[PDB]
Amino acid sequence: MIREERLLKVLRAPHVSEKASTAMEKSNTIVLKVAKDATKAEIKAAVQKLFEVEVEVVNTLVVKGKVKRHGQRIGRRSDWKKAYVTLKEGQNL
Amino acid sequence: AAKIRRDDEVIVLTGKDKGKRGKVKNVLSSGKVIVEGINLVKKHQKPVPALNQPGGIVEKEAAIQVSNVAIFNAATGKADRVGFRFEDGKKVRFFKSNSETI
Amino acid sequence: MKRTFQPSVLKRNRSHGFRARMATKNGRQVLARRRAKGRARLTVSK
Amino acid sequence: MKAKELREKSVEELNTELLNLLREQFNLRMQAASGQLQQSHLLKQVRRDVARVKTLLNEKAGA
Amino acid sequence: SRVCQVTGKRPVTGNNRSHALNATKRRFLPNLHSHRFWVESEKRFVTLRVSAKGMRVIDKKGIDTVLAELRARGEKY
RNA sequence: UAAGGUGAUAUGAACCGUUAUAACCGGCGAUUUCCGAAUGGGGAAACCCAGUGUGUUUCGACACACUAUCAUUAACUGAAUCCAUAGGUUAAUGAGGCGAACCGGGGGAACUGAAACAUCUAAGUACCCCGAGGAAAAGAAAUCAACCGAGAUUCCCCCAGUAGCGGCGAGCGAACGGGGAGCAGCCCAGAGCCUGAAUCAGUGUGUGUGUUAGUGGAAGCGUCUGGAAAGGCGCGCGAUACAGGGUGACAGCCCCGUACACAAAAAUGCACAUGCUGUGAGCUCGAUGAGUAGGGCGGGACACGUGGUAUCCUGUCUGAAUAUGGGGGGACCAUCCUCCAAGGCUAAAUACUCCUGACUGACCGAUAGUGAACCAGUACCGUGAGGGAAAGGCGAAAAGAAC
RNA sequence: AGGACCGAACCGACUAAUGUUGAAAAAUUAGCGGAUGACUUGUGGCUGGGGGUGAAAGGCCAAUCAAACCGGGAGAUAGCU
RNA sequence: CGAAGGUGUGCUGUGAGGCAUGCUGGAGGUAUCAGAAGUGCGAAUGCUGACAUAAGUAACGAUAAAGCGGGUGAAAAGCCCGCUCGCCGGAAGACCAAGGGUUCCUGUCCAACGUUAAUCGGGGCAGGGUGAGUCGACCCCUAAGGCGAGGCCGAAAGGCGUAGUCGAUGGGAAACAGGUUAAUAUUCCUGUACUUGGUGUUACUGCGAAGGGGGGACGGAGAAGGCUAUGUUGGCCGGGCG
RNA sequence: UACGGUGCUGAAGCAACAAAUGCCCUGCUUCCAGGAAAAGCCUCUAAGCAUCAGGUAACAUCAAAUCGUACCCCAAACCG
């Protein structure tokens, strides 16, 4: 079965929107922010449904949060998941 | 439960100019009320984005306490106290020693 | 030279971990006393 | 009393939930991280609406 | 556990007194030996760890009454 | 309940609302990731890997529910073995783990004192374990008493540092009896009659009283100094309210409140006209609890250290009478008195405070009072159990210093 | 074949010098001893305090050892300062 | 119209002390007589905080040394670039493991950090960066050992242990060259591959397990022989004519 | 040419010799001190079923999830 549309909320932020992300759109792929527990097939079905595109592969890396904070009140940024969704052909985006 | 409403003609009893009267601009949760023309402060404002972009000394209203201000009676030109006197949901305000609804 | 603390996290979690303390009754008293003291870490593992 | 959701007590709540979640939270999140001004209040509105629809679905499953 | 299983006798602490009346702790232990007891009604041998006093209780009362007391206690044969 | 709100530092953007419907408070629900008794299995806590079923399938898979162990009960099976039993499997019901103290029990020191120390003491204390409850334990006379009597247990005041016990040293230290606080007694070993019979539980919409939201609530002006009156001076008013806290300095009349009166959808606690259900009232007698009372040996407890040592408990070895009976009355014997052992239940007066609300302090005031007034069991140290800080104040208002 | 020889890595620690408020709470520099064995080393595991372990020194058991460390009895006691 | 505190001056009592005032201070203090004390400090190798001293003295951390030009900047011995110099080179090179956890890269800043200055840094502050069917873990298995239903044993806690279940430091399937970013590569791309399952189709057919068997599956020293990584040299090719 | 770093094109690209402590080799020899286990893998049956399940080969198609992946790397990122 196809994962339900409720589980198709795995896509969170449309782009990391950085220079390597734009270079990957020039090449073929689109860089996305996906929740933490999203499987590669979940990103695949999610992108093929929410966007119009056909995906060749998804590559996932979990980004680790930096401390980014002074010593009096130590904090940690939340870790997240980055999905390189490869669209070699049949890409409108 | 508020003697001083959001918009009410009030006259100061203590501090700065007591005789000054004006509409309350806002009522804040701290117990502090900003009333027009009653607390003017010369604020030295550095150039800051969005609001007050040119900068400059500005005349803005600080907030006196709500206890300092009392409502200005329409019938008589004196500060008069205000009581809530109705048994159901509408706590109607009434002038003390005058018994007129506010 | 060689020092007393040569770290190994496997030995650390087996020696002073939560499951290691939760197995023994007395280690549960260690955890209970740490909870009573109010510590953020009752176990070195986290 | 502050608000009554008599609209939610009617039927067909699941397609309304799919509309509120699918493409609504999806476009508001995508638009928000792209950078949209009004969407700050709208994001909270659609999240609370999703909570309301799911509460009514737990109360009654006919819709 | 050194429990008589019929009388419930168990080790009891005490002081091993001396001529100088020095109290050093000692333990008085029960006279338990495992014995095979023949139940004529059940047609089967029941094995119980028992003190000599418990064997005397069994010969005084019958193995069935003691067995009913054991099942009432929850003690297993 | 409300004219303001979107918790704080923390302002701003984007909005929400007019006592008729925003926020906020109360009650009741829903959701409630993962870890943790953790409970499908595993594990290096917050992770890895399954099975079974029901659906759906996009055939790639996706959801949801269940699946720990033990005790009890019931069923269906089922070995050596012949009948069976052990065993297996399933269903249901419970339990588990945590928590500051109090309580009961299982075990149990030493420093110390004795101006050493071994008997003794510290002390059945510290500690470990087990168990239960809102209290627990105890508890209805084989009890004291002394020829008079009292009448279950617990707690307080004396009795009283008394009698005693004691290397008669250090020390330990009752009881009788009196004053109170509280105070109901029962039940089973056993048949018949009566048969919710009096009770006691469970379960109850009706009734009152509380709690968890709240509401109303008096009466002050003129002037002076001052930055600002709350201070002064004058003249008033309130007061069942002059408890307190704020307000630009010290306010009974400025504001929260205060006395005082009122309120509760809903959820609950107590007393219940109390309905219903079940256990079981009272009447005649036959007995009223056997490896038990007792004894010998070794210990423990009684204030009592085995002493002249009663009494209670049992590790070991024995062992009655049985209401013609037996126990106690401090070695023991007779008499007299008093009570029925070897089966249980039971409120009150009592102990304590994790926690909550209100009020008080010849309590502290930032080297104090909690370790912590403060984003503290934090930083920091240590492999670990563990140890463990320093750190409050501008101003009335940021009017926090445009140029 | 060698608990053979000479000798790097490796393991150890014989003399000297410097350091001794050091670069270091036992190091550095010159020389030294073993280095196919009773060797050395990594990764886990086991043994717990009147206990362990010891080719034996009262060595070692987290820079702590004729009895580790942590909390409790505990404000032990102190005819002594 | 100036309370406590702090600081002077005068007066005053045998003293401990007191009274008045100037200055500062910006909300309190308490005649008199009673009552209770955390009721008086200069010492305890006293405890805590502040501040001196030695003293602007030792030191600035391997004796692998740097010089100059140019740039930048308010400032250059230390930053960047360039040219010479020296050092290591069975490492002071490069890669894994453990351990750490953003220290990686880019811009900006020089208050604290860096034993000096710092424009620089692993410092501050933002923004980026970690791409896998083939590599590890996960997983299948087991060793030492751990836990262990039932069980046995122990005063309670608990000890031991069968079935079982864990446990790598070992045994199990598979990808290499070249290119790429400021930072990622057996992961992205390009080229050429390999492995294990599922489903379907076709053909053929006896398949089938905590069972049996085989295999996995193993020591030390030593002696070749063959070969490769790798090096040298020649040829070739491109440039040189010092 | 911001001299970081990019865009295009590109000759020769062979032979001999010397080669490891690496490979063949878990081989060979020799010696006593006689040198893991289980799974993967192959094979044979049992219960069980019978144009079945199942196996074996081909062909096609789909899946190969999740975590780590920067950096230090005998050290200014480990322990001191």
TrEMBL record, chain E:
Q: Which Gene Ontology MF annotations are present?
A: structural constituent of ribosome
Give the range the annotation lists for the signal sequence: none
Q: Which family does it belong to?
A: Belongs to the bacterial ribosomal protein bL28 family.
The highest taxon in the source lineage is Bacteria
This chain belongs to the protein called Large ribosomal subunit protein bL28
Which Pfam families does the entry link to? Answer: Ribosomal_L28
Q: Provide one Gene Ontology cellular component.
A: cytosolic large ribosomal subunit
Print the keywords alphabetically.
Ribonucleoprotein, Ribosomal protein
PANTHER family in the cross-refs: 39S RIBOSOMAL PROTEIN L28, MITOCHONDRIAL, LARGE RIBOSOMAL SUBUNIT PROTEIN BL28M
Q: Which NCBIfam families match?
A: L28
Is Repeat among this UniProt entry's keywords?
A: no
Q: Name one GO biological process term.
A: translation
